[PDB]
Design a protein around this ligand. Structure first.
Ligand SMILES: *[C@@]1(O[C@H]2[C@H](O)[C@H](O)[C@H](O)O[C@@H]2C(=O)O)O[C@H](C(=O)O)[C@@H](O[C@@H]2O[C@H](C(=O)O)[C@@H](O)[C@H](O)[C@@H]2O)[C@H](O)[C@@H]1O
Length: 226
């Protein structure tokens, strides 16, 4: 009894340029499946026209992964001259008890490393400063370095919020409701990698493995500019 996100034309293009992974990295719906009305408890259209992602369990996900309309996986040069831009209007609900971090947007390399995660966190401590209930950017310092540089982007609100990721040359910027919150962070550690965007709900380190992470997107797109 779930309504498909494909019923809203504002999602046709991104769905044509995506596949849906749930609950792990395996694809459950390709672009053609999505466009043909795919819907489930973990991926459906709400009555006020949000595409909602929901998932339980540690490191489990309900996530769109950027594709080309040709059926090729997106695999653009992470630090190339062509700009890559993802734009989303996201409402992050108050998360269920036991949910501690939910990744909502990513730039990921074509192997095993997230270049950027934008996530909601219950708490984070950065350079001795603890912030509660915030949206965070995490940029990995390298493929062979498990550490990352973290930047608080926004105090969590349930209100619909515009996120924009702009990747061009070896730099990455993030705007939140029109304000630059990460200005040309260096991602040269991904020279020679290829990359793609992701969007959805990726449940990181929950304390209750049965609780559902839940994220809603009112608009979503990813584009190239040459
Ligand atoms: C890291 O995020 C990982 C996600 O949790 C998912 O597993 C994803 O699939 O891959 C991400 C990744 O590998 O980058 O998780 C580690 C971690 O939890 O161990 C983070 O490293 C720690 O970061 C904290 C901190 O900076 O707050 C440090 O105190 C700690 O010593 C580790 O360096 C890593 O930054 C990142 O979030």
């Amino acid at each position: 009894f779930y309504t498909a996100p494909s019923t809203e034309s504002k999602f046709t293009e991104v769905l044509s340029k995506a596949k849906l992974q749930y609950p792990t990295s395996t694809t459950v719906a390709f672009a053609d499946d999505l466009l043909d009305g795919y819907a489930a408890s973990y991926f459906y259209l709400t009555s006020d026209l949000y595409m909602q992602f929901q998932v339980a369990g540690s490191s489990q996900r309900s996530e769109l992964r950027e594709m080309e309309t040709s059926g090729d996986e997106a695999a653009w040069d992470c630090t190339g001259s062509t700009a890559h831009v993802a734009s989303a209007q996201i409402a992050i609900p108050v998360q269920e008890d036991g949910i501690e971090e939910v990744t909502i947007l990513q730039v990921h390399d074509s192997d095993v490393t997230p270049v950027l995660r934008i996530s909601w966190v219950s708490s984070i401590t950065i350079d001795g400063v603890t912030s509660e209930d915030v949206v965070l950017a995490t940029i990995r310092n390298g493929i062979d370095d498990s550490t990352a540089t973290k930047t608080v982007l926004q105090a969590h609100t349930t209100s619909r919020t515009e996120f924009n990721i702009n990747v061009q040359n070896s730099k990455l910027s993030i705007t939140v409701d029109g304000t630059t919150e990460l200005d040309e962070a260096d991602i040269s550690q991904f020279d020679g990698s290829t990359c793609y965007f992701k969007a959805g709900a990726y449940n990181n380190n929950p304390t209750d493995t049965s609780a559902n992470a839940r994220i809603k997107m009112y608009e979503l797109e990813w584009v190239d500019h040459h």
